[PDB]
Ligand binder design. Sequence first.
Ligand SMILES: [Mn+2]
Length: 475
Amino acid sequence: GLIVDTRDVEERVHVMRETKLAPTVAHGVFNPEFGPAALSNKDPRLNEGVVLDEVIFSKHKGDTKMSAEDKALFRRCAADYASRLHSVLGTANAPLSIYEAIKGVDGLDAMEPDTAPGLPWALQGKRRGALIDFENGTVGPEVEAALKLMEKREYKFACQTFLKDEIRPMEKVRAGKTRIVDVLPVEHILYTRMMIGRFCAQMHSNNGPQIGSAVGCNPDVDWQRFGTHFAQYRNVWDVDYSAFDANHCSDAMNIMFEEVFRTEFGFHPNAEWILKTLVNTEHAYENKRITVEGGMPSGCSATSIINTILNNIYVLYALRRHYEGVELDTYTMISYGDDIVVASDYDLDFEALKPHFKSLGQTITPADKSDKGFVLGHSITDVTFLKRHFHMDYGTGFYKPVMASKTLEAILSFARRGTIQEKLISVAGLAVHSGPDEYRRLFEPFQGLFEIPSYRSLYLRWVNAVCGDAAAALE
RNA sequence: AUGGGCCC
RNA sequence: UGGGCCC
Ligand SMILES: [Mn+2]
């Protein structure tokens, strides 16, 4: 997005500058090339001369403006995908009830009870529990007063900028490349959920290549599904984006919202409106108030769905801008936000598509960093999706999600105070797919000190998960 | 110390 | 409730 104005204000907002992530016994063994994001301006580890506050916002390189032609083409691609999407999902997208939006419905989890409330509630020193009753699903407004302002299309807000406390590669860490989280007001998240919560639930439950969204999936069981599909195509591309979320141009965002959330698809007219408030935003980082145009904030309720929708529309637009006769069945794809696998029997030229993606502000490069650009021939077994490869399991003959050993070493090397036992249980569910020799090796540093689930136990758990029949078939 | 998968 | 992973 394009930063339009920067200004200071008397009232400073608190920004958390203390990493909870301390190392573990594994850190001494594995010596990962990874470590906590730099949160403090004066961390000893940053490359001098530092300036976090400069790097953090450097992702905003502008707001690409599209020609009339390109906008019309994008509108065709957005409307076409919207057709495919609402065909599969149906058109039951009426406003979710205030109760439902808090409590969730089938395929849509409840709202978090004690997460950040956003602005202006953080200036008042107040938590979500004070503004909303989550056990019940009503009361405490305040909020209602915001509801009405949104209902009357005159609500305004600002995003509260937090620094993401997370493990990152040390090169990123040294360079002060700390990611930021754009916390929206809890009433906005609520209203967006009311406006498009049924739609989001339907997408989650209908995830897969057809709608081109992996949002709602469970890699353990769905890697079989996804893997088999993508193995039928001659060419499979692993497309990376650079700052996908920040570089959505205001024209693309507005048109997507107009075409995908029409009233004629069962949406309340404020569905479109509430999403359109994500385009031009105000952001509060300590004393600074930064106003931005373009880009998606991370804290919206449907951030993943929205990026995923955009991702789908971008690929159709890019292909149609270069080639002719390009339709939805020309290729296949699944996306989770910026993350994407594309495939086609046609020998598509993604290196030539680069400039057409540039017309939307987006910069594509190959995942396989090998000197050359995009090429044909790559199969499903070469690519990554959600930090997981597709490897065929020798025992069951199903695809399983395999994370790279180095990524697992990094995950295991750090933990928040007192979460280490839980962490190892959870992470073993990931590690099991690396095979038993690698599984033991990854957990060796913890033997004697914690409970490490056996390889066999989790293997049998996974067989029943992916295919309950194959589990019984062995017995 | 966001949102939303999923898992415990 | 409270953890972990991915985006
Ligand atoms: Mn624009």
